[PDB]
Design a protein around this ligand. Structure first.
Ligand code: CA
Ligand code: CA
Lengths: 165, 163
């Protein structure tokens, strides 16, 4: 029984857009999982009366060891997070497997999503977001959060889990 | 300034089909909400790599006072819960509003969903189901449950009331 767990979601608040414009969904394998290929994995997100399906665009190691994973100067592959695609950032990967789109024991990946582009607007306060990240094989990671009623800083913890990023 | 809350989800376990074949999703308005029209409301469900949308069909009062919410002999409008439609049952109402698809203060409605029809199989053990019930106006009710590791009884409480 292999599968993926969501270990957190953070959002970027852009005050000029009035909301959360970008999401970072942190993923790790279930304890004891076999390796899982991410390359055909689909991200399903429901928001505001629409369901969206996003596909794998590419992977980048530019996120590795970085405090700011929302910055498109430092992580230029944000340019590929569009209305129908996510980018995978490497967070932790001892053996390098994520650079071939394979997540294995101990790995942490982040799914970079341009919510402004997917939803055609930034996500306002008190908004419900629901979703699953489903690779071809194994069980899915689950996304559920309600954005807070006030956005007070640029990086917002949306879904809290324990596992380190 | 209005919305719906999911106050729970139960499911029916069918041994012949090998899992949960029906869901009952219980809804009530958020405190302070204005009346909400359900007639154009959509139910979005994600399970096993597919996203499904279900539309409003009809509303039944046959669910009022029914101790078995899954009995399609008693609640004949279960026949209209198919791969693309849910049915609304009235559970609590004091002004008849739900009889014409409007939910208002103090009301509880149930959404009857034929999971077997929607997903083309019964929901097996250890499954993740995520969803939202979104009327045209107001904030949505949220569905999120993990089916248990074994099905030990006919009716399973899948999701509970949270604050
Ligand atoms: Ca690895
Ligand atoms: Ca009423």
């Amino acid at each position: 029984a292999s599968g993926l767990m969501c270990i957190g979601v953070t959002g970027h608040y852009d005050k000029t857009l009035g909301g959360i414009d970008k999401l970072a969904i942190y993923i790790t394998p279930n304890a004891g999982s076999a390796p899982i290929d991410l390359k055909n994995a689909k991200l399903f997100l429901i928001y505001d009366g629409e369901s969206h399906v996003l596909n794998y665009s590419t992977v980048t190691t530019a996120t590795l060891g970085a405090d700011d994973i929302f910055n498109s100067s430092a992580i230029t592959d944000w340019s590929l997070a569009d209305s129908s695609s996510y980018v995978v950032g490497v967070i932790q990967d001892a053996d390098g497997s994520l650079s071939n789109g394979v997540i294995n024991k101990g790995d942490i990946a982040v799914l970079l999503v341009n919510a402004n582009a997917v939803f055609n607007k930034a996500i306002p306060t008190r908004s419900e977001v629901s979703g699953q990240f489903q690779p071809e094989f194994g069980a899915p990671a689950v996304i559920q959060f309600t954005t807070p009623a006030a956005y007070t800083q640029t990086v917002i913890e949306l879904q809290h889990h324990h596992h380190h990023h």
